[PDB]
Structures are given as structure tokens and as C-alpha cells.
Design a protein around this ligand. Structure first.
Ligand SMILES: Nc1ncnc2c1ncn2[C@@H]1O[C@H](COP(=O)(O)OP(=O)(O)O)[C@@H](O)[C@H]1O
Ligand SMILES: [Mg+2]
Lengths: 72, 463, 116, 174
């Protein structure tokens, strides 16, 4: 009944906005800012050491690709 | 099955597999889309392993599928690796084509047991005055060349190769661990200009590569040497094997860089807590056993000219003859810069080298020590406050310090004078006379950059 | 809203929690409602929390105290009216000679002149 | 580590449920929440950085449907503030263990080399009652890897009579 319970959850919560349309794999949201180092959330396709461009035209270098957050 | 990447922190990837098909501790993994090869280090549980990368980690996503090989890193061995340049994974990088062998051996292996420990003392004459007189070598024993940055470890190693390997009837292995690529190219072309390229096998994980390459590189270099040692040809005996390593310190340095990333508390200065063990595991495979003998020469870097640093201070216990270079002597113009008071060897005892040689060496060291002690008084006070014996000792000690200088066969590029090769008997005879006082009438400038004692007299007469 | 509340005090280091939409920039100056005390933002800890350094004594400050923001770094009075006066870091007269007679303010955190 | 951090929440939940006489409802709710948080898509939609804790609690209320109450809502609100929502499965496991212990019921697993019939299972159930519990929940599991014998696992206690005899004899041989 555990897998049927999971299916019941999938029914009660319909699709969840398609997870905000897969949350747009090439997207993020700044979480922490300190001393020129920031942490971004949700850059699923962030490749190690690539250029991340923010909203003002700046650029960043990804340093840590952790399980849930991307340092820069 | 296959796993996927969930973190990438510098050179330390980590993968999540199924709960059933987790790999072993030193298995090898291959990223599907690329050529990066991973080696497991830790096993974090819950179907997660933590590996390090044998290549560059630029442009790796999270979620790339990873497949396992269920076997450690395997390198080719045999005679097909002779005269070839190879990388960490044993892939040819001299563009001569693939290696023509089928043999394989894992690079992770236990040291020979204590039962199979054959230790011999058969002297080896290198033709260098200070090395022969003070710290003699032994065929089958481990040697080290301690020294700072730029005091001449590599030049001394290339000199010892010239005096031994060229006349050596037996194979060899050169393993560069984090060094200048220019030096590797120069060595390759020097061997190829001569005809002794068919007697060496070369492994180069150099100083421009990620720490994964510099870490597990010496292991391949001596994995080949182990096979060369433990080999028998029918109606033939074992082959004597040389082994030259360059800056084995870089092996531990590359382990320090990935220490914190593996989740360990730092040790005394900055080193990993497993420094001594991870040095012993490597250093215990270099010994020589009942079948075959491995003569080893190793240059060992010394950080910030500090012989107390944990890594050089840990390496001392693993060597038979320790040659310590000094920056002051090199800055004084004396080459080689070998320090006569720190060089030691287990082969310097009366029962091995004879009574006369032992007495000469001890007398030379005593004279140098007394001069080193007098050096402080003659600075504040004058040279004329001392008695006559002390002044005589000072003059003799300066002459002795000069007489250890020698023009190498490979150093004629820097200076220009041709090299010299001094037999042991000439060194002993010269130093006996110099201690007896027979040469008190020779100015000390005649003992500088000369061979045997006859050149000293000739140069004095020319002056 | 710009207003937020104090949630932590450790000596001279005070934390403030804003709602997640209105977190202020770094080096912004905050004014504590009901008292006279200026806080400078040092880093953003996420989830609407901001860690600040207090400019003055912190005794008598309690948690859950409303804090308002200025949306700008510390501003000081400039001009010819500042000649002959003594001022603290925040640009206030401590020579006991009345308020500064000027109207022009500037932020104290600005970029150094460029190469050109 | 995760089990250590789940002690107080599980103990408090069990104490409240036992004192309110609603242990079954909390057990069902906790299992549902553990299954929900175990899901990948739901967790991804839950850890969005824009959501306040109230939003997460409301999302849990929507997915849970009925069986919710002020007690469960308050529990989830308290968990969300400290950001311990990720460790719900450990809380559920601890709660189930405490409920089983309070009822004097212990779980056992009987693993054999052949499928068992009713009489052997009943005999083993009767035998294990000498551990003096309320009942045993026997979950039989066939293993062709074994040759013969049954191994029973009760918590951390195991009783072995199977092919492990071969290994035990091998060690004594060598
Ligand atoms: N035997 C020697 N006699 C005179 N000069 C030397 C001698 N060996 C090295 N030098 C010089 O001293 C330096 C030695 O550096 P090198 O042997 O190449 O490597 P390392 O950095 O390990 O000391 C070089 O500049 C070399 O020209
Ligand atoms: Mg060097």
C-alpha cells in the first residue's frame, strides 16, 4: 500500500505546477551573499567552473556544486 | 548497474549507486559522456561513494551517469613498456602506437612479507668524492637526496644515472611525480640521443596536472618495477632493476590538497592525519626481496628549507643512505652542495668499508665539526686570538671544504669545464695526505673544482 | 514592508529578520524604531535574516524590536558648513554647537576612481 | 546522526498521541508524510526558496487531505521553523518502534530455504511467545541462497542454524 499511497499523493497534489515547469534547469535564485561569495539554488545544469550571469550584467564562477546549492 | 554524480567539489566527485551494487574501495569508474576516470576513496554508506578524478573536472554536470568496472586501475607491464612514455592510467603518450603487451597488474598491492626480506651489502662506486667517502651506497638499498628548492637534487640524480645506468646491465624505470615537463622532455631526448632508450620505461604525471594524476602516479612507476624485479627467464637469473623517482614529496603534497575535501580534520601543520601511513604503504613496496633487487634513488623536496617539516622528517626513517643538500654551501659556490655533516649511511662502518676508509671519514668529519664550532669566535674576535693548532685546523678545514667540489659530466653546460670521474682510491689517498699536513703549502684556491689530488698539485704549480 | 524585527543579540552583533521579499542590500544602514541606534548590514544569511554591526552600545535592546531600513549606506553631511565642527562616524555634532547647517548628504561607501 | 536528531520529536509526538488516545491517527499521518517527503518531485516543489514555513505547512495540509488536525499542523509548523522537515522518515520509524514497544509487541522475521506452511509458522510463533510479548508479527522470507534451516531476526537479536554452520566449521578447520 506504500506505492499506492504514493499514487494517492500524486492524485491529491495534482501536478504541482509541473514542478514550476521543471523549474527551468538553467535557472537559479541567490540565497546567501557574503564578502563577494554567493550561494545559488537550483542550477541543475551548472557545469563546474562555468560563467553564471546575474540580473545586472555581472558574472560569476561556479566553484562548489553541492547536492542542493551551487557556490560561486 | 550505474550511478550518477551528486556533488563536484574540486577534484572530489561522489556518486550514488543502488543499495546493492556499490563498488569496492579502490574500484575504477568511468563517466559515460567523457573520458574522466574515477577512483573510489571512501564509502559513505546509503549507496554513496566518494571518489577522486584522474583528469580535469571542468565542464561536468550533476546527474551524469557513471558505470563501474569492478576492478582497480590496471597498467600494462612486461618488456613492451621499455622505451615508452606513459601516463597515470598506462596509456602511451609518445604517439608510437598502442603497447604490444597483454599483461596487466593492479597498482594497489600489499608490501612483501617480512619472511621474504633479503638485505645485502655490496658496495657501489659512483665516482663522486663526497658520496664515496662519506655516504657509500649499497647495491639494493634505498637512497634519498634531501634539499631545498634549487640546490641541485635533479642534477645530482642525473649525474648518478650517468655514472651507473650507462654501465648498468639491467632495466630501469624513471617515474616523474609532479615536476617540470621540460625536464622530462630533456631526459627523453637525452636517452634517445644515446642508445640506452631501450633499457628504460618512463611514467610522467607532471606538475601541470590535477591532483588525482599526481597522487596515483608513483604507484604505476613502481608497479612496473615490481614486475621487472619478480621475473625469471628460463636458464636465466633475475634482472637487476633501477628505480628513479623525482620529488616523492609531491606524492604527499597531492594528498594534502584533497585531504579536507575528503572530510578529515587537519593534522599538525596542514597535513592530512594519514601522512605517515600513506607514506609507509608506498615506501614499503620499494624494498628488494629474495628474488630480484631494486636500487632506488629518490629526490625529496624540503619545504621552506626546513628539515623539521613533517614530511621530510617522516621520510628519513625509510632510507638507507641520506644525502642532505645545503643552500649555504651552494650559495658559497661549492658544487655539489652536499652537506658533509648531515650525510649518513648504514654502509659506513669498519666491517664493510674497511678500517682505513672509516678512519679517514671520521677524521674528516671531526675536522669539519671543530671548524664549525670555531666559526663563531673568529667572527666577534679575530683570527689571531686562537692558538696555532686552531688556525691550522681552520686552514685544513677550508681546504677540505674546497676539495669536495667536483665538475660533473652533466654540469658542463652551466660552467663549461669537462666532467671528472674520481675513483675511490684517489679520494682516500688525497684526503689522507691532506689530513697528514703534506699539503699545508698549497694555497686553498688550488683545491677548487678539480678531480684527484694530482690536479691540485698541477693547478698549484700553474699558479 | 521595509520594517523588520530583531531576533538575536550577541554583544555588538545584532541579527534582523525581514520578510523574504524585502531583504536590504549589503552596507545598508538600519534605524531602530523608538531609540537612536544605527545598524550597518554586513552579510545576508538567507531566509530573510541579516547580520549587522551596531554603532553604539547595545544594552537595553531586546528581541522582537521593530527596525526600519533606509535603503542606502550611512550618509554624512558635506559642504562648507562642516568646517570647524567635530563629528562622529554618523555625521552628528558632538561639539555642542547646534545642528549642522548644510543639506547635502553623500554615502560613505562608493567606488574608487577608475583608471580613465 | 539522523536517528539521533529525531529522538525528541518522536518522543513528544508519541507522548501526545498516547495521552490523547489517537496513536493510530498519528501513525497513519506520519506514514503518509514520510512517503510524501520521500518523493522526489514533491520534495523539489517543497524546498523552493520562496516558501515561508506557513506555505510548507499549508502544502502538507493539502497533500494530506483529511486526517489532519491542529496537532499535526502545529507539529509540522514547529518542524519547519527549525528546518528539520527532511528527517520525517526517521521520526516515523521511531514513532512506530515506540508504539510497538508500548504494546509489548515485537517484530520478527523468519528466513528459510523453503516456503513454510501454516503449522510450522504457528509453532514458531508459539515458541517465540516465550520471549513474553503480546504477539509476534512473523514475516516469512524464502531464500534459495541458503540450503536448509531458518534464521530469525528480532531487532538486533539473530538466531542462526543455516549454512552458516559451514562457515563456522571452516573457521575451525583453518
Ligand atoms: N653540480 C653542479 N655544479 C654547479 N652548478 C650546479 C650543479 N648542479 C646544479 N647547478 C646549478 O644549480 C641549480 C640546480 O638546479 P637543478 O639541479 O636543475 O634542480 P633542483 O631545483 O631540484 O635543485 C641549477 O641552476 C644548476 O645550473
Ligand atoms: Mg628542484
Amino acid at each position: 500500500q506504500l506505492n499506492p499511497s504514493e499514487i494517492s499523493a500524486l492524485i491529491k497534489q495534482r501536478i504541482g505546477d509541473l514542478d514550476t515547469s521543471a523549474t527551468a534547469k538553467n535557472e537559479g535564485t541567490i540565497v546567501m551573499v557574503s564578502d563577494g561569495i554567493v550561494r545559488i539554488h537550483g542550477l541543475a545544469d551548472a557545469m563546474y567552473g562555468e560563467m553564471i550571469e546575474f540580473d545586472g550584467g555581472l558574472f560569476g564562477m561556479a566553484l562548489n556544486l553541492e547536492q542542493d546549492s551551487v557556490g560561486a | 548497474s550505474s550511478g550518477r554524480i551528486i556533488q563536484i567539489i574540486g577534484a572530489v566527485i561522489d556518486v550514488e549507486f543502488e543499495r546493492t551494487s556499490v563498488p569496492k574501495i579502490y574500484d575504477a569508474l568511468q563517466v559515460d559522456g567523457t573520458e574522466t576516470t574515477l577512483e573510489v576513496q571512501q564509502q559513505l554508506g546509503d549507496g554513496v561513494v566518494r571518489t577522486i578524478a584522474m583528469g580535469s573536472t571542468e565542464g561536468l554536470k550533476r546527474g551524469l551517469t557513471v558505470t563501474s568496472t569492478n576492478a582497480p586501475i590496471s597498467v600494462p607491464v612486461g618488456t613492451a613498456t621499455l622505451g615508452r612514455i606513459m601516463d597515470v592510467l598506462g596509456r602511451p603518450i609518445d604517439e608510437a602506437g598502442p603497447v604490444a603487451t597483454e599483461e596487466r597488474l593492479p597498482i594497489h598491492r600489499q608490501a612483501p612479507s617480512y619472511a621474504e626480506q633479503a638485505a645485502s651489502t655490496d658496495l657501489l662506486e659512483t665516482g663522486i668524492k663526497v658520496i664515496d667517502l662519506l655516504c657509500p651506497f649499497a647495491k639494493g638499498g634505498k637512497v634519498g637526496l634531501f634539499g631545498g628548492a634549487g640546490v641541485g637534487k635533479t642534477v645530482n640524480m642525473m649525474e648518478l644515472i650517468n655514472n651507473i645506468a650507462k654501465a648498468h646491465s639491467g632495466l630501469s624505470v624513471f617515474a616523474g611525480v609532479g615536476e617540470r615537463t621540460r625536464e622530462g622532455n630533456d631526459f627523453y631526448h637525452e636517452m634517445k640521443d644515446s642508445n640506452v632508450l631501450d633499457k628504460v620505461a618512463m611514467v610522467y604525471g607532471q606538475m601541470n596536472e590535477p591532483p588525482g594524476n599526481r597522487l596515483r602516479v608513483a604507484l604505476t612507476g613502481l608497479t612496473m618495477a615490481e614486475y621487472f624485479r619478480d621475473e625469471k627467464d628460463e636458464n636465466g637469473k633475475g634482472r637487476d632493476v633501477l628505480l628513479f623517482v623525482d620529488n616523492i614529496y609531491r606524492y604527499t603534497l597531492a594528498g594534502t590538497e584533497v585531504s579536507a575535501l575528503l572530510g578529515r580534520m587537519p593534522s599538525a601543520v596542514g597535513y592530512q592525519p594519514t601522512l605517515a601511513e600513506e607514506m609507509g604503504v608506498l615506501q614499503e613496496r620499494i624494498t628488494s626481496t629474495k628474488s630480484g633487487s631494486i636500487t632506488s634513488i629518490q629526490a625529496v623536496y624540503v619545504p621552506a628549507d626546513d628539515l623539521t617539516d613533517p614530511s621530510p622528517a617522516t621520510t628519513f626513517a625509510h632510507l638507507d643512505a641520506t644525502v642532505v643538500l645545503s643552500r649555504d654551501i651552494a650559495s658559497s659556490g661549492i658544487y655539489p652542495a652536499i652537506d658533509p655533516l648531515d650525510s649518513t649511511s648504514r654502509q659506513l662502518d669498519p666491517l664493510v668499508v674497511g678500517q682505513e676508509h672509516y678512519e679517514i671519514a671520521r677524521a674528516v668529519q671531526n675536522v669539519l665539526q671543530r671548524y664549525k664550532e670555531l666559526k663563531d669566535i673568529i667572527a666577534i674576535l679575530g683570527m689571531d686570538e686562537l692558538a696555532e693548532e686552531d688556525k691550522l685546523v681552520v686552514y685544513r678545514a677550508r681546504k677540505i671544504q674546497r676539495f669536495f667540489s667536483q665538475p660533473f659530466h652533466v654540469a658542463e653546460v652551466f660552467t663549461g669545464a669537462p666532467g671528472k670521474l674520481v675513483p675511490l682510491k684517489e679520494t682516500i689517498r688525497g684526503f689522507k695526505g691532506l689530513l697528514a699536513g703534506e699539503y699545508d703549502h698549497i694555497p686553498e684556491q688550488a683545491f677548487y673544482m678539480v678531480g684527484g689530488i694530482d690536479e691540485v698539485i698541477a693547478k698549484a704549480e700553474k699558479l | 514592508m521595509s520594517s523588520g524585527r530583531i531576533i538575536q543579540i550577541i554583544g555588538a552583533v545584532i541579527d534582523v529578520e525581514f520578510e523574504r521579499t524585502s531583504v536590504p542590500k549589503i552596507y545598508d544602514a538600519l534605524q531602530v524604531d523608538g531609540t537612536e541606534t544605527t545598524l550597518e548590514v554586513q552579510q545576508q544569511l538567507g531566509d530573510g535574516v541579516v547580520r549587522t554591526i551596531a554603532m553604539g552600545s547595545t544594552e537595553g535592546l531586546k528581541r522582537g524590536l521593530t527596525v526600519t531600513s533606509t535603503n542606502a549606506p550611512i550618509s554624512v553631511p558635506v559642504g562648507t558648513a562642516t568646517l570647524g565642527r567635530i563629528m562622529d562616524v554618523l555625521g552628528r555634532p558632538i561639539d555642542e554647537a547646534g545642528p549642522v547647517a548644510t543639506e547635502e548628504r553623500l554615502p560613505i561607501h562608493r567606488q574608487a576612481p577608475s583608471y580613465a | 546522526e539522523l536517528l539521533t536528531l529525531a529522538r525528541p520529536y518522536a518522543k513528544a509526538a508519541f507522548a501526545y498521541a498516547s495521552e490523547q488516545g489517537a496513536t493510530d491517527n498519528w501513525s497513519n499521518a506520519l506514514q503518509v508524510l514520510s512517503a510524501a517527503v520521500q518523493d522526489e518531485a514533491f520534495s523539489a516543489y517543497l524546498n523552493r526558496p520562496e516558501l515561508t514555513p506557513a506555505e510548507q505547512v499549508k502544502l502538507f495540509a493539502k497533500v494530506l487531505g483529511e486526517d489532519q488536525s491542529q496537532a499535526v499542523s502545529n507539529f509540522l509548523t514547529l518542524l519547519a521553523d527549525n528546518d528539520r522537515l527532511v528527517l520525517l522518515p526517521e521520526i516515523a520509524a521511531e514513532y512506530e518502534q515506540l508504539k510497538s514497544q508500548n504494546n509489548n509487541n515485537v517484530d520478527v522475521v523468519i528466513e528459510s530455504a523453503f516456503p513454510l506452511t501454516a503449522e510450522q509458522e504457528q509453532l514458531l510463533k508459539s515458541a517465540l511467545e516465550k520471549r513474553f510479548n503480546s504477539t509476534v508479527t512473523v514475516s516469512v522470507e524464502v531464500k534459495p541462497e541458503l540450503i536448509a534451516g531458518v534464521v530469525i531476526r528480532a531487532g538486533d537479536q539473530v538466531i542462526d542454524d543455516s549454512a552458516l554452520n559451514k562457515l563456522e566449521k571452516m573457521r575451525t578447520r583453518l
